[PDB]
Amino acid sequence: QFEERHLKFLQQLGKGNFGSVEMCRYDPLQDNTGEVVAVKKLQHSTEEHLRDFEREIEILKSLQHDNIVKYKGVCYSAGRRNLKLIMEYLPYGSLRDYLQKHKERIDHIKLLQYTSQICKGMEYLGTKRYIHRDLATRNILVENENRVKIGDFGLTKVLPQDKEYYKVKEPGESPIFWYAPESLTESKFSVASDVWSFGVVLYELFTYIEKSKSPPAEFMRMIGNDKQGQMIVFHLIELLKNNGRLPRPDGCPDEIYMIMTECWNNNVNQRPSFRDLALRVDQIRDNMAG
Numbered sequence: 674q675f676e677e678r679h680l681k682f683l684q685q686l687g688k689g690n691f692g693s694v695e696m697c698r699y700d701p702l703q704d705n706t707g708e709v710v711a712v713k714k715l716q717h718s719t720e721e722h723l724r725d726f727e728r729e730i731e732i733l734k735s736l737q738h739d740n741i742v743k744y745k746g747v748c749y750s751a752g753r754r755n756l757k758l759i760m761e762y763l764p765y766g767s768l769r770d771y772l773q774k775h776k777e778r779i780d781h782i783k784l785l786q787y788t789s790q791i792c793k794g795m796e797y798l799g800t801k802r803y804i805h806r807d808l809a810t811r812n813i814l815v816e817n818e819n820r821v822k823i824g825d826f827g828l829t830k831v832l833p834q835d836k837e838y839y840k841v842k843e844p845g846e847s848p849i850f851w852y853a854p855e856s857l858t859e860s861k862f863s864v865a866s867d868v869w870s871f872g873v874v875l876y877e878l879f880t881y882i883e884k885s886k887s888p889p890a891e892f893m894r895m896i897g898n899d900k901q902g903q904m905i906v907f908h909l910i911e912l913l914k915n916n917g918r919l920p921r922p923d924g925c926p927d928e929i930y931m932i933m934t935e936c937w938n939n940n941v942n943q944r945p946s947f948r949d950l951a952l953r954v955d956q957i958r959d960n961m962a963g
């Protein structure tokens with residue numbers, strides 16, 4: 674129930690293939706005492722893209738969890754229906770940027786804490802048969818030193834009643850370096866495809882986001898940087914098909930790297946569950962404690 678006139682633009686928080694997110698202050702009193710919120714809108718507003726957004730809004734409105742970014746509401750001139758999603762604003766921003774800025778403060782124990790939180794949110798999603806389909810550190814938000822949330826659901830899809838995967842091919846650019854093989858080859862997205870991406874997220878975390886060590890770089894290094902266009906995808910597939918994998922990050926413990934590789938099983942059903950992951954991560958943490 675947000676009125677556009679009282680939305681004061683502060684800054685840009687991010688961009689998407691066809692969306693963006695702004696930091697705004699909602700100040701109806703025009704006394705500058707309103708809260709600061711996050712606003713997502715569309716850049717390309719095709720009837721198709723609207724359908725998706727409306728669905729994204731529904732999905733988010735339907736989620737209630739400590740590790741999921743809070744839906745605050747919607748706004749639209751009515752008007753040509755210039756739809757806008759209002760979410761809570763997280764002051765520490767994306768886990769990706771945070772992690773980078775504070776590598777010196779954040780130890781492995783702490784990475785495991787966030788890791789575990791992510792699993793709990795992912796598990797909550799799978800509960801509603803939602804496939805996230807864009808798991809990444811950019812897309813995790815930091816609410817405070819001790820808590821993260823999943824903060825974007827632009828690509829999230831709901832599973833059909835009678836199937837455990839969803840087939841979908843997206844126009845233009847895909848985060849292929851986070852994509853599971855069946856996603857690359859069949860455009861198949863399942864909880865298990867989400868676990869594959871989680872593995873990469875875990876990887877991201879333990880690279881502390883050093884640029885030379887990113888998935889795209891590490892894979893391109895592995896494929897050879899002469900590759901371009903479609904060819905990149907094709908080599909990527911061949912590479913994974915032959916058990917090529919991202920390397921253990923500098924300083925990563927073997928037990929942690931093992932979790933990553935279990936996530937990066939070619940064999941879809943041999944990938945762990947989010948509940949399993951959380952338990953194993955938590956067990957590990959406990960062992961770190963003493």
Ligand SMILES: c1cc2c(ncc3ncn(C4CCNCC4)c32)[nH]1
Nearest residue numbers: 686687694711761762763766767825
């Ligand atoms: C909602 C998003 C959101 C937020 N609060 C702070 C954020 N910083 C970056 N983001 C991005 C925007 C681009 N997509 C990933 C999240 C933030 N609240």
